[PDB]
Design a protein around this ligand. Sequence first.
Ligand SMILES: *[C@@H]1O[C@H](CO)[C@@H](O[C@@H]2O[C@H](CO)[C@@H](O[C@H]3O[C@H](CO)[C@@H](O[C@H]4O[C@H](CO)[C@@H](O)[C@H](O)[C@@H]4O)[C@H](O)[C@@H]3O)[C@H](O)[C@H]2NC(C)=O)[C@H](O)[C@H]1NC(C)=O
Ligand SMILES: *[C@@H]1O[C@H](CO)[C@@H](O[C@@H]2O[C@H](CO)[C@@H](O)[C@H](O)[C@H]2NC(C)=O)[C@H](O)[C@H]1NC(C)=O
Ligand SMILES: *[C@@H]1O[C@H](CO)[C@@H](O[C@@H]2O[C@H](CO)[C@@H](O)[C@H](O)[C@H]2NC(C)=O)[C@H](O)[C@H]1NC(C)=O
Ligand SMILES: *[C@@H]1O[C@H](CO)[C@@H](O)[C@H](O)[C@H]1NC(C)=O
Ligand SMILES: *[C@@H]1O[C@H](CO)[C@@H](O)[C@H](O)[C@H]1NC(C)=O
Lengths: 48, 48, 801
Amino acid sequence: TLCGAELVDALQFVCGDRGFYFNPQTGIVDECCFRSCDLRRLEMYCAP
Amino acid sequence: TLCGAELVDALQFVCGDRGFYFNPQTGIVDECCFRSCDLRRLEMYCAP
Amino acid sequence: EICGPGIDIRNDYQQLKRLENCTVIEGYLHILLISRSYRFPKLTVITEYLLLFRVAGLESLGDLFPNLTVIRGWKLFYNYALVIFEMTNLKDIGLYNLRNITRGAIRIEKNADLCYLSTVDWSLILDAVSNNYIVGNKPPKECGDLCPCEKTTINNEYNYRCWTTNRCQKMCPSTCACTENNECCHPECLGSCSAPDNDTACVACRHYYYAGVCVPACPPNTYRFEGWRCVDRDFCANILSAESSDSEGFVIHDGECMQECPSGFIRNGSQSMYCIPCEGPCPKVCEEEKKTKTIDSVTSAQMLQGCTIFKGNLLINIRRGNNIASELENFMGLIEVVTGYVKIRHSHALVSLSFLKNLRLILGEEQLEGNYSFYVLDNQNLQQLWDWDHRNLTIKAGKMYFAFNPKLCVSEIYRMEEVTGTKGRQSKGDINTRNNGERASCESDVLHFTSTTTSKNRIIITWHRYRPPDYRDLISFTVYYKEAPFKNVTEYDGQDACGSNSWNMVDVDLPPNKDVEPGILLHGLKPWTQYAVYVKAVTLTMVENDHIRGAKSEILYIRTNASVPSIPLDVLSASNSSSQLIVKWNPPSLPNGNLSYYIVRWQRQPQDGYLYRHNYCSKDKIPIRKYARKVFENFLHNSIFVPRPYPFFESRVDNKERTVISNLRPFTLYRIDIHSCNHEAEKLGCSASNFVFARTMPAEGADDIPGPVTWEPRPENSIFLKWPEPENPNGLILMYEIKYGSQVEDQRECVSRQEYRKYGGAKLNRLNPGNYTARIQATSLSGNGSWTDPVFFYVQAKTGY
Ligand SMILES: *[C@@H]1O[C@H](CO)[C@@H](O[C@@H]2O[C@H](CO)[C@@H](O[C@H]3O[C@H](CO)[C@@H](O[C@H]4O[C@H](CO)[C@@H](O)[C@H](O)[C@@H]4O)[C@H](O)[C@@H]3O)[C@H](O)[C@H]2NC(C)=O)[C@H](O)[C@H]1NC(C)=O
Ligand SMILES: *[C@@H]1O[C@H](CO)[C@@H](O[C@@H]2O[C@H](CO)[C@@H](O)[C@H](O)[C@H]2NC(C)=O)[C@H](O)[C@H]1NC(C)=O
Ligand SMILES: *[C@@H]1O[C@H](CO)[C@@H](O[C@@H]2O[C@H](CO)[C@@H](O)[C@H](O)[C@H]2NC(C)=O)[C@H](O)[C@H]1NC(C)=O
Ligand SMILES: *[C@@H]1O[C@H](CO)[C@@H](O)[C@H](O)[C@H]1NC(C)=O
Ligand SMILES: *[C@@H]1O[C@H](CO)[C@@H](O)[C@H](O)[C@H]1NC(C)=O
């Protein structure tokens, strides 16, 4: 499971130059760090 | 919580010279080590 | 003198006196939590395991059991035949007569004063020496393993072998099972010998033992008991297993005398000393002390879980409850034979007795007053029995009484006595039409469906308009739909009017306009899923005519349209070799149709561009990238203490969820996209991608220098080394290291990759004159290469002719 600075490294790797979208604190840590998430779930945190 | 060799040290201390009774593997570790147990629960593991 | 079947000495030091007469201990032996001199030369054999734990004052095991020879270990303590754990003051394993441990391994742990561990060759005492566990004792470097004899090879060393500081480790000659001094025992013997090669002069018998003789197999009229001796037929007829409600004697089977018949066997009637082979799943007969088991709750029915035959009577009285039809069916669904009667009284929650499925026999040992074996009374919601044309039933003796069951159609219980076989056995008042079938709608009309329209999650279904039999009746409809994997679906699957076990119910009214027919739109359904749908009419009759009709439709099976499948689950990848990548995954969560094949894609990933710029002779850490006792203490504590009460390449995997990619650049990252198609993916399109990243194995020997190193003198007292660059490195060559020196290659030079790209080599500047040797090593992303062959160069003290 990805957590902390190790997580945001994979997030910047998956999105790459695409970026991250932005626009109830059960966030990505409670999704990809508390539990195991695949890279398809990570990619949905990127931009269009 | 008491566990391992730290547990059997308290068990010999509580019983002292009284001893331990003997006569489904959810034993004392799943009672006094997995969860917190008070010394009254420990004393019931001794002899009469 | 045999002692057993289990010795557990603890607490009192003087309680150890129970071994004063025992020469053989049948079962295990526990010497636990013990806090003077006690000697037991009688004991020689222990059938099961031996456990020692926290015995204060004991310095050596030879003080207690000097003649202990064989620990057979028939039954093991966590796969161990001897456990010496947390033994304080203990200095050595004084079992200098121990010869053979037949089965398990040894665990000697946490003995801060225990010596003579490596002085014992456990390879000639036991067999599974690899699975032993000797950790946490007094370190052999901080002990003093001294002998006062013979020796052999232990691991890779050869050293003496002794048990204690006075006794050696006794061994048999290569000619042989031997006696005290060089005379081979009997083949059926084991350990030592009171006399050479005699059956009646053996300290311990291998295989089996009977009448003072070491016999291979038991005599004809004797059977195997425990794992070392043979007993006769009358002995096991006197043994009694651990006391329970269903505790009985021991059985004789396969020439063995065990506690209970093995799996797939049951005890024979009358002749209850032998096991007869039951072919099906052998029954689990449940015997309860109370004469009539009353099931007034789901918690009370729990005691009937897994029972096949019930020796007693069943009294069902379930007023309230939870989800009951699926719950009782877990407990009572396996009951097949009821020895007595069955009474369903006041069971208002029960709309059907279908939870008693495999019940195919009701005898009649005891019958209710009036000779009744099936007695139901006051069941305000019992619409149907479990007697549909699929199940079988046979009541051997007794009558049937039915009263005050309003929702039960009287025709259903007439159909019961056909299979039951008690047609003309009951009286005229046992089955009465007055208080039974009072609110029941037996003969009902047929609602006909008209059209069905299916999408991937919505279903439109309409049925014909229904004119009630009377003009005044107010009419409404109710749609029953549920996901059914296959067709064996009954209309009765819930409990009372609250049984939300299965059918989803929606009340749709008759439309006002008479030209449009009643229908319903279902929303939020799983794509490609067979749904069981049927409509029931709600006829509220103003004139309460007891000629109740009603309307009910046929069970219609409707499957929704397929959709895009889900992403594959848990994509894992590894690399067993260079240019190869193995990938495995799971089928998608929602296939949404029949799976046809998988489409996997792999794309080359570029090497990191930031890696090429930095000078790595200054950085301390160079980046590397890759390819592709507590649990025993819990078991010992849970048993002892008892409390008192780049382009994409695409390939299709036809069947399996695993594939191997071939022809790849070694030590290169790859993106692995995996898709999941179905039978309708030709029009809908294949699913999305659950992707993963994996790097191949490094090409072995490809990141070293591919040629010889050349040298040329330079101004000052310098030497310019020149060597070729690896053509195909494992990723990228980061830096080179030169190892040079006059006599010993002491001086070391770091050559960065940027420095090599300019000069093609490195210049060792300003050296003292003399002969030199040099070696160069390339460090790639996977690791370093091998050093080159030494090149020889000289530095002249005066550069001249
Ligand atoms: C959801 O999926 C349902 C199937 O699971 C669909 O129901 C199916 O719908 C089609 C078209 O509405 C219907 O007709 C099929 O068979 C016809 C006979 O082969 C075929 O017509 C042929 O002849 C025409 C000329 O005679 C020609 O022009 C045509 O190209 C065909 O060669 C027709 O085109 C189609 O192949 C099926 O009978 C029907 N299946 C069932 C079991 O009802 C439904 O439409 C889907 N709905 C949605 C919203 O996706
Ligand atoms: C201790 O004696 C037993 C006696 O059974 C030996 O057990 C042997 O085990 C191997 C492997 O399972 C079998 O192939 C042999 O047939 C067994 N022996 C007999 C007589 O049946 C065991 O090897 C002995 N251990 C030592 C260290 O001598
Ligand atoms: C990386 O360098 C190490 C040592 O610097 C190499 O390991 C040596 O390999 C030789 C065989 O060529 C052995 O004789 C040595 O005993 C090894 N030494 C050590 C410390 O392991 C290693 O082979 C180099 N990597 C590669 C891929 O060749
Ligand atoms: C229908 O019968 C099959 C075969 O006996 C069984 O697998 C399935 O569970 C049955 N349906 C239900 C709802 O139990
Ligand atoms: C270097 O090696 C050569 C050849 O082995 C030898 O003749 C010479 O004496 C050595 N020393 C120097 C200083 O050249």
